[PDB]
Amino acid sequence: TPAFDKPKVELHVHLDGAIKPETILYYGKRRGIALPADTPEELQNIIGMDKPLTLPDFLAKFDYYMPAIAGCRDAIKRIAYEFVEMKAKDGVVYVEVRYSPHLLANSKVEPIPWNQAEGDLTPDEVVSLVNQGLQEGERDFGVKVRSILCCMRHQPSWSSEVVELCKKYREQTVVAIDLAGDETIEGSSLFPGHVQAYAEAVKSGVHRTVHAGEVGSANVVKEAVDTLKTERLGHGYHTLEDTTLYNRLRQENMHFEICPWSSYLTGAWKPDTEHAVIRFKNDQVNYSLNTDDPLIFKSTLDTDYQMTKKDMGFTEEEFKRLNINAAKSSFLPEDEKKELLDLLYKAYR
Numbered sequence: 636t637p638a639f640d641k642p643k644v645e646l647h648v649h650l651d652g653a654i655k656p657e658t659i660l661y662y663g664k665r666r667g668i669a670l671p672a673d674t675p676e677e678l679q680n681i682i683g684m685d686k687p688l689t690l691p692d693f694l695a696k697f698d699y700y701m702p703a704i705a706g707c708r709d710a711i712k713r714i715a716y717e718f719v720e721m722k723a724k725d726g727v728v729y730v731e732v733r734y735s736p737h738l739l740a741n742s743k744v745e746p747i748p749w750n751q752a753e754g755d756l757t758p759d760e761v762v763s764l765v766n767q768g769l770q771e772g773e774r775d776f777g778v779k780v781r782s783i784l785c786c787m788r789h790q791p792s793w794s795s796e797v798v799e800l801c802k803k804y805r806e807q808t809v810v811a812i813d814l815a816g817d818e819t820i821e822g823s824s825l826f827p828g829h830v831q832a833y834a835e836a837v838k839s840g841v842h843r844t845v846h847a848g849e850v851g852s853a854n855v856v857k858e859a860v861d862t863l864k865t866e867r868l869g870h871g872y873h874t875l876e877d878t879t880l881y882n883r884l885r886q887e888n889m890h891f892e893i894c895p896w897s898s899y900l901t902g903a904w905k906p907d908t909e910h911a912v913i914r915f916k917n918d919q920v921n922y923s924l925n926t927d928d929p930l931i932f933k934s935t936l937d938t939d940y941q942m943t944k945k946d947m948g949f950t951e952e953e954f955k956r957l958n959i960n961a962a963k964s965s966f967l968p969e970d971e972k973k974e975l976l977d978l979l980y981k982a983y984r
């Protein structure tokens with residue numbers, strides 16, 4: 636039954652959007668928050684979704700559970716640990732998971748995320764704890780894992796700490812920086828704090844990726860490339876509305892982090908037209924298949940592979956070409972990237 640019954644590579648998925656329902660119950664219960672339900676699947680139906688909704692509808696999902704996970708020191712380590720385990724079942728051999736350390740913080744973070752009262756969990760140790768849970772996960776379930784840290788469009792004041800956090804924990808899982816949280820706000824790509832952070836990223840050798848084009852115009856995709864100096868684009872479906880941009884990214888081998896199921900459940904893509912990925916497919920574009928938020932979207936990597944092959948006619952060779960490009964574009968050192976490529980080359984025959 637499963638679509639691509641071979642090893643995979645994932646470069647786009649949010650930790651704070653890949654938490655087991657049961658683990659949220661456990662913590663919400665043990666802390667004093669209570670969720671809109673007390674049964675696993677019950678909680679999985681209310682904070683998840685089976686049909687496309689609007690932005691605020693989507694955003695509300697986080698409002699439910701995040702206050703239950705964020706703040707607790709061992710809740711963060713457990714979610715990271717359980718994350719690696721999840722990828723194992725999906726058959727992923729290499730995965731880059733991202734997140735905003737600040738949105739899990741409850742100390743030294745203004746404003747303080749999701750209401751939440753003050754405390755002592757500083758952003759700095761939030762990522763260190765994720766590192767830990769991630770590394771244990773790697774050794775216990777057998778998946779290679781790296782972490783990307785996220786900046787938030789609306790809160791550019793946190794950006795400097797992000798790059799610093801990336802440089803401080805270099806190697807120890809964190810290999811890149813990201814920009815997330817509503818590319819729709821005017822001139823957000825160009826906010827000084829954001830551009831200075833990415834400028835710092837180049838100056839200290841930390842890789843770069845930017846959410847852009849999912850629901851933003853081609854221009855935001857262009858700002859991400861020309862100003863912030865990205866190496867990869869999250870989604871970036873809208874770069875099609877600008878041909879010299881597209882034509883240029885094609886010859887420059889830009890990597891697109893695609894999440895087809897997600898683009899549906901968020902409205903990014905209308906079922907009326909043909910997904911932006913078939914166009915990429917037909918143009919031999921360097922892109923990857925990604926889950927994004929398995930919790931909110933009640934999916935798994937397979938969910939996305941099923942869709943590409945079911946309603947888009949994706950063949951097993953396209954899936955291989957795809958994942959191999961994913962490995963070339965990963966933010967892995969060259970030695971570990973060769974090793975990774977090699978693995979997939981032998982296993983893809």
Ligand SMILES: C[C@H](O)[C@H](CCc1cccc2nc(-c3ccc(Cl)cc3)oc12)n1cnc(C(N)=O)c1
Pocket residue numbers: 649650651652690694697733734735738785815816817818819850927928
């Ligand atoms: C960067 C983090 O992991 C997050 C934090 C979620 C969040 C917190 C506060 C404000 C936020 N604004 C967004 C947001 C994301 C996309 C658009 Cl087009 C508009 C708003 O997401 C937010 N995350 C997780 N999944 C997504 C996602 N799929 O976009 C974002």
Ligand SMILES: [Zn+2]
Pocket residue numbers: 647649846869927
């Ligand atoms: Zn995303």
